[PDB]
Structure 1
Amino acid sequence: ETVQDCENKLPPSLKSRLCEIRRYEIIEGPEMDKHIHCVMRALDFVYEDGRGDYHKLYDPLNIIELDKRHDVNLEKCIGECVQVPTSERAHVFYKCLLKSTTGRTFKKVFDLMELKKAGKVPQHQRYTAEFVQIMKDYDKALNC
């Protein structure tokens, strides 16, 4: 199940807000709890119960930009998600990550790994100016 599959099975009320969703705007609700669990699983960033996976993010985050705060932020946000209902866990992890200083590098890792799995870039693709245009053209084709 891909990020594209997840968005296809969005309810009308959220499909109309795809573009907000895809710029990582936070939207509350049990439907968004569901969807974010879906995408976070699709890109492999969380376990089945929705707990963030430190080891899926640490190096990729530091490789994009080296920052000791990545460690701290990962531990914090795993800290948080472990304390909430499972139905909610992935979304809390993701919300916490976005609000931390790691959020901006997280979006890049996320972007790069969506596009790597979709086959649009090579596995070793870095976050370059070309990549930003590729992701722009990728979103435009989805009406975003």
Structure 2
Amino acid sequence: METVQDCENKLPPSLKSRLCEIRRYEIIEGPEMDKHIHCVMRALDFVYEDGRGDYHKLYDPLNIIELDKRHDVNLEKCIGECVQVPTSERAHVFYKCLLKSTTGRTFKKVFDLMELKKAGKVPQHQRYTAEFVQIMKDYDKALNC
């Protein structure tokens, strides 16, 4: 429905100048950030309305790129935490927690892939390849990043 691009188009002036930090997965505290990240996590279909992580949107994608028993653990852990916080902070807390975990490495790849898939820049079965990395680099560079 509403693209990650659409969320970057609401960024309060304070945040718009730090777009490259955000798109680099650097952490910045809200609730300006709290509600942009809920925008993007919702746009890529990773969270519910209340902003809770969807285990089932991530488990298979994470494991296809890097097969690791840790994804299950991290997903359970991070969903746990996003549940004990308020619904304006929740999507952002699940995001943050994942990136800190050992699933961070692969979550970033799944996130990048889903962003470009949804934008129609890469096909649906696109894998995290050397070509894909360059595709994202050029994508980011068109955004001044």
TM range, normalised to the smaller chain? over 0.9
Q: Where does the alignment leave 5 or more consecutive residues of structure 1 unmatched? A: none
Per the TM alignment, residue 69 of structure 1 is displaced from its structure 2 partner at its CA by: 0.2
What secondary structure is seen at the aligned counterpart in 2 of 1:56? helix
Per the TM alignment, residue 58 of structure 1 is displaced from its structure 2 partner at its CA by: 0.1
What is the CA–CA distance in structure 1 between the aligned matches of 2:31 and 2:126, rounded to whole Å?
34
**Alignment of structure 1 residues 14-93 onto 2, 5 Å:** 14-93=15-94
Q: Could you tell me the TM-score, scaled by structure 1's length?
A: 0.99
Give the count of matched residue pairs. Answer: 144
Task: State the partner residue of 2:14.
Answer: 13
Per the TM alignment, residue 29 of structure 1 is displaced from its structure 2 partner at its CA by: 1.5
What is the CA–CA distance in structure 2 between the aligned matches of 1:43 and 1:27, rounded to whole Å?
20
What is the CA–CA distance in structure 2 between the aligned matches of 1:114 and 1:74, rounded to whole Å?
20
What secondary structure is seen at the aligned counterpart in 2 of 1:37? helix
What is the CA–CA distance in structure 2 between the aligned matches of 1:21 and 1:8, rounded to whole Å?
14
What per-residue deviation string (whole Å, max 9, x for no partner) do you get for residues 47-74 of structure 1? 0000000000000000010000000000
Give % identity.
100
What secondary structure is seen at the aligned counterpart in 2 of 1:117? helix
Per the TM alignment, residue 112 of structure 1 is displaced from its structure 2 partner at its CA by: 0.2
CA RMSD in angstroms, aligned pairs only = 0.3
**Structure 1 outlier segments of 4+, above 3 Å:** none
What per-residue deviation string (whole Å, max 9, x for no partner) do you get for residues 11-39 of structure 1? 00000000000000000010000000000
